[model samples]
Target: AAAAAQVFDVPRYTNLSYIGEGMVCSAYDNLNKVRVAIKKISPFHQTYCQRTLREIKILLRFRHENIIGINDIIRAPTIEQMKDVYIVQDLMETDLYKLLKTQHLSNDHICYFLYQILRGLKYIHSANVLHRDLKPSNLLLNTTCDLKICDFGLARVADPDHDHTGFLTEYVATRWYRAPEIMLNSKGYTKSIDIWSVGCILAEMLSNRPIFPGTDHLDQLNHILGILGSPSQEDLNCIINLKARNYLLSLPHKNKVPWNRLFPNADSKALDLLDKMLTFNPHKRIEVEQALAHPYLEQYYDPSDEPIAEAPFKFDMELLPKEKLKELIFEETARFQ
Candidate 1:
């Protein structure tokens, strides 16, 4: 602590525009001569503080074309001088959410984007992490159609055996992209959870609309049932919660919509992959590696694609006492100085 006790100065970079996430500024780096997105770190609350640290930790570990990269990190010269923390990262043309609003994407565009996501996610999961929050907003994009997954705030290590913090609840993921196990409050989830989200995202790309636009968690499942039908008894057994189990069983059985009928123009291979990726059972769901190898993604697949850096350890900080967690994050932040 004594050696790392020295104060460090925040770098010189000014925010050019005042739009988007809090403290996000497009700053020009004199050294690199390029504009970088600066994300502000807030430590007002335990959640905010941990999220800030978790994102930094994950950012430090990731390196892939489909994953956003960090340019630099800035902090106050001293603990007392710290008012705001800054994370400098690569700039992009826009995000998937923004792109979806103004224009409609073709199948080719959808395939390109989904392949990148699967490739990136394959790397992330290979490092034993689950990007619990996979959605259009978190999928950063550029004019050339390059996509990178961002926003590690809700991500968690994909270790089912680890008794992590209470924060690892089903509520972590966005309702729209959430898997059935998450929505049903099932315990012991795994990496396949991400594949389910990719299925939803892939569907959204092809249809140009959210596949299951649930107004809320309950409504979200209802929306799913309306299209995909009721879960099998075997799948229902995976639900750990009694109430969720009872409620799900109470609903009348529904027959799933045929792939050809749902995606009338999609090729047979695409539909086949969609059926496997969106399976009700996580164990039964198509894995990320499998999705990458699927015929639908074959056009974008490259044998050279592989996972990157080892993720900085620490699966769940919520288990640590708040103050200790804060101290650990502070130490790690100091190292970045």
Candidate 2:
């Protein structure tokens, strides 16, 4: 059975704006002229409601330039006896997934974006946080192309002393960006999992397509093995669970492909860096801080560059007049009858 739920009364803010809705919550812009993404919850979705709170708790503890900031958590007003949960977060202009769909990201842009992501991840990992759900969609971008790691619903606080004993195994991240250890059903993995996702994201940024577009777990493994060759016996030995050892053993070694082949026009240095980052062995994967200091990031990164900040208030509700706002609130309440 689940635990008891947390409840809050509706906030007394004048302006409110309606944003898009998610599977479990409806986002709203708030009165402060900043876009506040509200996640609405009811009794039926109480399990998610608890997870959201956990996400908030973890996010509030994070304070880094590359991480999204949480502002507040409030309750929706009682409308027709239906109450809701609201989480106020920094309003991002766009997310990396959306940006990739529209614009062709240049090598320079991809490097800069990835640098920011690694910096954020480094910060989170330093705080003993593991963002189990790292993906393009979870990475938010401001107008300046600066990146912030958001969406902590699947994140966990790793215990170094216990060696990541509490890690969840429900297959958290998006399939395409999943790590090899995760795909292989490894238990008690560490922060290296996110590094794998970062590698996939970097590849996507350079190629303008998913690195591994596998429809299922097997397909995903095949896509990775096809490019990087099969894992060695040593690789299989490291995985906590060996259920998929045969799959790794059956894969054939292939000639290494130069990164430039993946992005013909990209900088050689950038491609070189990507090769090291996308290593099949998690142990060999570059750490986030080291990656940040890599020549690709150092030579291309502009220190003077400032990441874009999210809007301060929810835009939708901030535009309405005080009197009209009250009327609309009343009307919304009346509709439930």
Candidate 3:
């Protein structure tokens, strides 16, 4: 028989303080000398349980410097009996959202920061996984310029056989960082959706505000069209959802805004990458790999820095079973043994 499992107790960590709200129950784990951010699951339910387990699986399997990794998971009969899933991870002082709150970052800083995200995205996309949500808050910052992607609960694994209609839901991403395709439900989920989110995030970092700060779904599209102008019929045809296509076509003719005039402060190359990343057509959008190699990010690109995971992990887990989830947790914990 397998060895007896451990117990998860609040007293295990030296300074366990509740640092999270919402669905997450986070705290500092000073135990074992690893005082990092730990996600102690208090939302003892089926859906969140599956999400946490999926996130744990992804972190354990998809390892990269830019992606968040699990230091170790607390396996305990007490946790299982109480149905509390604990997540222990590397800690950081703050997130990019809080860092960029008031600081008007320079082009050089913005360029480097964006390259890090692009680099991370390139690595992650190589694994056939879409971050789905790529807002500044999810990007954790260390004391240095180091940035890491976190919060994989919303992340989706791109699988052709799976129905990603659930992943494509409008509520997955925050309103401002959401892509045009997602706002309109225009097409099936793809990696470009994440690129679009990154594009919006880039715009926000430069201007210190959301590019598409919309009140509603339609309003979000309006905000996008306000700056970039309305999409042409050619662009609309690419949208798989006919209703969304027609809605875009019906909008009043708005002239396209030149990147030079809109962002005169930004250098040419940065604007070029921005244009490529913000394409109305999903197919036309700049791929993660392509973005990594763009001339705007030329100085930062390196062949050796590229990422290639162990093929891609299956992403569809919206309907995963409870026992399966527990088994996965155990198998992953033992895999590292």
Candidate 4:
């Protein structure tokens, strides 16, 4: 497991209180006039160090209503003391994951949340970036029902020259929110992978539990296939991994579960969007723009309000020495104010 930051070097912000810990950082809420969520990211290894750089670069470029914006980056007084990076983001009441555990969501609440996610996703995709780590816990929500997508540790900037497919890691997201194409490690996948995660988040919001709660990768596929039913022969042929394909063929045939059966209390419009978003074939999954216009979000969806990025974010950051990475991070922190 990645270790949390041993110390927060930022003294400008007063009243730092520990809130929680993440895989690569520890969170603290600064109780200033304007509360901010500060993530202390310790660059333990080269991999983590690069991820930290990528997140900061993307957050610096991305500006959208439904996406988390960086408020500040606490710079170290000296370059020698810059082992850790403190990122300050707007504080939300809680994340969607924590909120779900506390209480059930109304129909309106679900629709609004789903809309905001898609809206944010649309903007992200518009910038030619795929939010590879989309999940409920990564979604921050406030008491007023405002939702913003956060945690870009796994996000990747799509290579425009490479048919919109970037060099992605096999394990990009959590087991439950992972897309089938990613689980199978398909040769080429589009931004639709994020769509599958959105589908999982939507179903979880409706049912108040993960729709595909699997014990392992194999079980993860089984849970998905169990609910969405076994992929069709055509869809199976699309599987690039022979091992994964054979495993699916070996499993007993399962029938597709109706959306209404899974979410009886959910509106038909919401179920319809969910069905499209959860398509087993990534090629068939609904695009974020189409999802934003889906009937379920009509009440809240407005083309005028749904904005896109001015230009695609370029993130072809090459490997750098540890010292170089630390210098770059310090330079980024110095940019604010």
Per-residue lDDT of 66-140 in model 1, one digit per residue for the tens?
A: 988777777665665665676778888799888887787887888888889988988888777778888999999
lDDT digits (tens) for residues 1-337 of candidate 2: 1112322233433334444543222234445655445455442243454455456556655667789875665533443443444455666788999998989887778877888898788777766667878888999887888788988876666533444221234564688987766666543236777888888888888777998899886778778887777676686686654455665666677655667777788778777777777888778888776787788888645544422222211121122333343334334333222
Candidate 2: stretches off by over 4 Å: 1-17, 22-32, 43-46, 76-82, 159-170, 237-242, 299-337
**TM-score per model over all chains:** 0.88, 0.75, 0.86, 0.89
Indicate whether candidate 1 or candidate 3 has the larger lDDT: 1
- Whole-model Cα lDDT per candidate? 0.75, 0.65, 0.72, 0.80
Tens digit per residue, CA lDDT, model 4, 20-68? 6722223444444666777777784778878888889889989998999
On the 0 to 100 scale, the lDDT of residue 299 in model 4 is 95
Per-residue lDDT of model 3, residues 167-192, tens digit only: 13557467777777776653335788
Worst 10 residues of 2 by lDDT: 309-318
Two-way lDDT contest, 2 vs 3, winner: 3
Q: Give candidate 4's root-mean-square deviation (CA, Å).
A: 3.9
**Ranking of predictions according to lDDT:** 4, 1, 3, 2
* Candidate 4 displacement at residue 95 in angstroms: 0.6
Model 4 vs. true fold: TM:
0.89
Model 3 score (lDDT): 0.72
